[PDB]
Symmetry: D3
Amino acid sequence: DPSVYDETAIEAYDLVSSMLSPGAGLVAWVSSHRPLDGRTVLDLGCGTGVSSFALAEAGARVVAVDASRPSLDMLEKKRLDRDVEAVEGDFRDLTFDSTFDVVTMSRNTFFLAQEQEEKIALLRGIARHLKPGGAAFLDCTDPAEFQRAGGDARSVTYPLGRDRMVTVTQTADRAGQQILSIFLVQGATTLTAFHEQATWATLAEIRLMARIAGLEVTGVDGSYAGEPYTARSREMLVVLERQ
Amino acid sequence: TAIEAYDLVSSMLSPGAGLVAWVSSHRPLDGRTVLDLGCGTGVSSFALAEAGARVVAVDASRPSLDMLEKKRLDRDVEAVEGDFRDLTFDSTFDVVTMSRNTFFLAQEQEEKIALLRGIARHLKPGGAAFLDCTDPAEFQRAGGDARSVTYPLGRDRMVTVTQTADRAGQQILSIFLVQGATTLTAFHEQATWATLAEIRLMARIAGLEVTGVDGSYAGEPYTARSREMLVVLERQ
Amino acid sequence: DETAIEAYDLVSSMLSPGAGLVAWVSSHRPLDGRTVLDLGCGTGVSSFALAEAGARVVAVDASRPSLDMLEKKRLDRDVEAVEGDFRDLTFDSTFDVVTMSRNTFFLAQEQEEKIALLRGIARHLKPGGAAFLDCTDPAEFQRAGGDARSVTYPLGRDRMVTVTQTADRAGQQILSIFLVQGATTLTAFHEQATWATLAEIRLMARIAGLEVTGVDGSYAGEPYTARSREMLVVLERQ
Amino acid sequence: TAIEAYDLVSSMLSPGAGLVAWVSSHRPLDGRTVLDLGCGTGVSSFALAEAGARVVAVDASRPSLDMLEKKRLDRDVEAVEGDFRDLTFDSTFDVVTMSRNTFFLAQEQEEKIALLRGIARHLKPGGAAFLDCTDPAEFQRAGGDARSVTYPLGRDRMVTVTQTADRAGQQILSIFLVQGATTLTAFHEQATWATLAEIRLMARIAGLEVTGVDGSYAGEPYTARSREMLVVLERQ
Amino acid sequence: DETAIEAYDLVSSMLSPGAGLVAWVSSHRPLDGRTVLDLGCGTGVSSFALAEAGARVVAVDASRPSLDMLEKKRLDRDVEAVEGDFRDLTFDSTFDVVTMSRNTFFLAQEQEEKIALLRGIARHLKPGGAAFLDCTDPAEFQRAGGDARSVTYPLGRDRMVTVTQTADRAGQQILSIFLVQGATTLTAFHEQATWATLAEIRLMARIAGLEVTGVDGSYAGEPYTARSREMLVVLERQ
Amino acid sequence: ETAIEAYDLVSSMLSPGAGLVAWVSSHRPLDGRTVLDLGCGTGVSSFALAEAGARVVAVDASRPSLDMLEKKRLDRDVEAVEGDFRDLTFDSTFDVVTMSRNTFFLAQEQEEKIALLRGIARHLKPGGAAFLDCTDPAEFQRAGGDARSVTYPLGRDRMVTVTQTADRAGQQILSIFLVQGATTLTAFHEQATWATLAEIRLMARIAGLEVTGVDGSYAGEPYTARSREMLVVLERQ
Ligand SMILES: Nc1ncnc2c1ncn2[C@@H]1O[C@H](CSCC[C@H](N)C(=O)O)[C@@H](O)[C@H]1O
Ligand SMILES: Nc1ncnc2c1ncn2[C@@H]1O[C@H](CSCC[C@H](N)C(=O)O)[C@@H](O)[C@H]1O
Ligand SMILES: Nc1ncnc2c1ncn2[C@@H]1O[C@H](CSCC[C@H](N)C(=O)O)[C@@H](O)[C@H]1O
Ligand SMILES: Nc1ncnc2c1ncn2[C@@H]1O[C@H](CSCC[C@H](N)C(=O)O)[C@@H](O)[C@H]1O
Ligand SMILES: Nc1ncnc2c1ncn2[C@@H]1O[C@H](CSCC[C@H](N)C(=O)O)[C@@H](O)[C@H]1O
Ligand SMILES: Nc1ncnc2c1ncn2[C@@H]1O[C@H](CSCC[C@H](N)C(=O)O)[C@@H](O)[C@H]1O
């Protein structure tokens, strides 16, 4: 069956994201700005729900959007009794109209709207789907981190339990602001490779994009702990609200 | 005295020839009109006029224009006092220039947008604007920690440049300490940089479009290895 | 040499003002009306800042010319200038607060000298008092493999100082050359120090009867971490 | 089997198209004779043959030539066992190629001189030799400390490359660890680099002259910012 | 664990063979017919190199599975395997030489534990004996700011190990993850250590009755300098 | 000329001859031996060699530098000779030939270094040795060749700022020297073309010499990847 290849990749992705990007940091960071217990969350690029389920475990009701039907398939299988509604859609152009208390984009998902005009269209969609007093959250690596080796290939290998491992190889083009991550997930007798390419935006770009789209950046933290964003920050956690 | 030192540093460290050679590879200058924004004491303006151009040189510093005039001799340069964040005249030009990093002296993003609006309003239909910039990645190589380099300025003068930066505010501060055998003059300039991606958006808001970027005065395309960011803009 | 002391006082006044030390110290212990022992006081930049927060300051330096400059500058500030070696303090007296301004602690060069200093600090602390070692994080000194680096700072409109630094990681030695210039003047001096990491200081403190009870990463008082560039050590009697 | 693993690594990480494009920009290949030295399993040789060249391909590894001949099909490539430090046949060619860093596998300087002498002896009057090399400054960036990068090789295979260097001996060692879900094949190559300055000297000794140097397959001039050192040599 | 110990023995045998340790020790104390206490002996990579130089070896480790492997490999070599905690040795023998192989000293984590370890070394040295701490220079652990880095090494033709390290400069903590692989096998283990600089070690040694008497920068015996990447510490009594 | 006086002060303080003398003495005796010191300048190297007992012939193309040498010479056995070390015309042989720190790089083109080395071979007695005192050129590349400045004291009343740029493809290194007192400023510059040890081996062979030793510091450590100096000992083939 052909789609087993993509299913195995989605399973690997879910394992990598579960261990290397748990939802807890996003949940801790969002909660420092807005209450989640009893509120509504629009989670854009929910994937297999690592971010979505952690938001639900904080008491939120989550509407979780992804363009990948197999990833939503895995979310529904793992959902169990969690209050997460899986929705197939393109976060560059949301068709349905509703408004939420908080909107979230997990670590670097915002950079998967590649072109600047795609980021703008995405932000217009976030504005249109935000309650007047709502706030949207862009969980991002500070893009300075992507330029540290001149964009040359670098590889780091992490354990995924004592039976699995993942090697991440990353290259970047500073002029196009492109970053490409190859993921090689291995067990004793298995190897699954998949990749993902993103176009980053700096905080200064996001201020202009937000302004174009009808949003305003109202806060930036430098870590999940809520420290303010400074030159020494390695993360760029953007809070936005309607103009 | 500080304006004199400023003029010497600019004449030696940022001569106008590269800007002229880079602008010339995109637009002819002999006989064309040029609006030179942030002309200062005129180092860029003079080099443009000497390429054939009728130049209108604009600066907000009356004392810098004073020295432009005393050094202009017979070059075709009309010095004008004005704020390039809000130009108040009605001319239209073949070519608009901003010398090395002058663009970064419109500090806030809204000020760069107001400046680029003014530039669009003063371009002829087929004109082109030129932003001579350091690639801002260069400002970030030391984490923004104070670094100093010392340059000769002839056989009798020298300048020490000490720079600090804040990457989050995109601020860069340059302190200039100009010395002779028995003189010391100090001055500083602080700028807010913007990346090419930022400039693409600012251009669009303002009514212009980036139509080319070069990586050096020689005309290499702008790549991740470029250390300069030479932006060409046209009306959309 | 007199011109050297003037140049030193100007550099310290501009690039190491006492305001930061006073703010940090005030985060942990009150100064208004308390007694402060300021060790390695120099020409008084730290000491005057401490006196201006209301402390009764006893200021100790081994450099009689520096103390002379301190006394010239002192005016009515409540600072007593004492010539002495802080590796071996001669007088008996206990204080609410003991201070060592930025990197002065590293001027007791050998580890045994640092230990002798810390014992003196312990013997001059009131039971509830605290000692404060204001230090650069010594990781900062190893940044270029100890190779010579120079940075030039303005000192107002008409003066400047170029600081050239070299370090030897194995001896934990750092050498700073200060070249102070005006239009028609040039004065050079130097200072060589031996740094100690926080881990070393914990040991030396314990040997001397002190305990490291707090470490801040900057004058603003956030905790010391791997990302800190300053190492501001609070110590108390055991 | 290490031969199979090497062929896979080279086919995907250093295909011949780059070398072919670079050589083409200096000499035509359609219908010409080409001597490909250290041809290996023929990644370079077959790209050259597909450009229309008649290729004699020399390697000292008979298992590698076995793989070449297995892969050849109808491509115009003659496989020859030989040591390019001492080529013992007499034919004369239009173009001589050595693929990425193969020139560095003649280890000692005298071996490199012997190799270049053989290249001169096998070049036709208006012919040209091509040394495709990394710029050796790239090998010193980490002080020669061990560094590892892991590359995909399609969906179900990968190679980890671990490199160490010795600046004083100009030695670079590469370990290749090729893996699939249930396989692991390891092999290594050790090389001795030479800078452009050394190559100019070795060339004159051997009877050649460096006539061009490019910094990339796209034919940019070689400069301080180049990361490749592509050398064109002609007979004296 | 059984496969974990085997993976460890392969990694140790190939990435840190005993030959270097023995050549270094032998340049300070000839070993033929001497008694050697090898602390943190593991599966005996250091212990058997020492025995092969002619020493009579007591090899101490807290891991019974590792000592079982040592005993399986021992054959005729003069090594006695003893289960014990080197922070607190309960037997009373004395030795010409005490060895701790590469970075094993850093596995006595806290400063107080290193001191107890060093006291135990002193109590177990004969008159004129010497102890040898084979360490990486901890400056190496601070490149990259403690950020995760990975390096992959072959282990023969058909096995490999990827070592991934992270560090916290303030805690002086270094964590190494070892991922050992064959064509169809994957075994992961890890070790976390607390480093100490030479300056720290001098102090701990003195607190424990010992004295740093020599420091080499490599197994070849050249002196320890700012350029050294290894810190090979020689200790003797009083 | 003030430039030469500043040159002498900078060279005397930032590059004393003592290290060269100690390194050379660890390979050949100097006491009563003959030394050809090429590119002697104002004699910082030549005088330190004479203090070790050498009978020194000191060659330089700058007549004003030689004038200052003769003026500082006083007692010492140093004969100043105006000449071009790429084309030495006198005919004498010596026990030792020296080139002080980085002077070998002032023979700019590779063919000029080869002519120099041929002259060295022609002026060495059999059994003699030649010494090229050099910075390891890797040091010139540490900043990608970007401008870097370091300021050194020159006593209490003088200083010098050295600003260096490099072009790794041309193997060019440019040093600008800004010498100051309280009331003076004198600027001058020197540009050189470096050669690596591997280049020097080949150039030596072409010229009839052989590299027989390389040290990594004046102490005589061996030359390794961690060395920051490249001290080359050469002998006739
Ligand atoms: N235009 C688009 N519209 C919707 N989803 C998109 C998209 N572009 C990318 N995605 C999705 O964005 C996801 C990014 S990975 C993050 C997944 C999840 N939030 C977690 O916490 O792990 C992928 O699932 C991808 O399919
Ligand atoms: N609105 C404005 N805001 C900031 N700087 C302005 C300005 N209008 C003019 N300037 C001038 O911008 C100049 C930057 S320096 C560049 C000067 C000149 N083009 C040269 O080639 O040297 C200063 O002279 C500053 O006074
Ligand atoms: N052993 C010692 N005993 C006393 N003072 C000493 C000393 N070693 C160094 N010092 C003094 O410590 C000072 C260091 S500079 C700090 C000066 C002052 N606290 C300020 O804030 O500027 C010098 O004045 C020096 O003379
Ligand atoms: N004398 C010699 N010394 C070293 N390697 C030699 C050699 N003669 C041939 N070679 C070969 O040089 C090759 C280097 S890699 C092979 C490159 C091949 N042209 C490709 O494009 O992939 C090896 O195959 C090696 O066996
Ligand atoms: N407190 C302690 N007491 C005894 N052994 C300890 C210990 N802490 C760690 N160890 C042991 O120290 C060893 C470190 S690895 C070094 C093993 C061996 N010397 C070799 O050459 O390979 C491990 O075997 C571990 O179990
Ligand atoms: N071709 C050449 N022939 C002779 N001297 C030369 C030369 N090229 C450069 N020089 C000289 O080489 C000298 C280099 S500076 C070193 C001077 C001296 N040995 C010392 O120890 O300070 C200069 O004096 C310069 O004039």
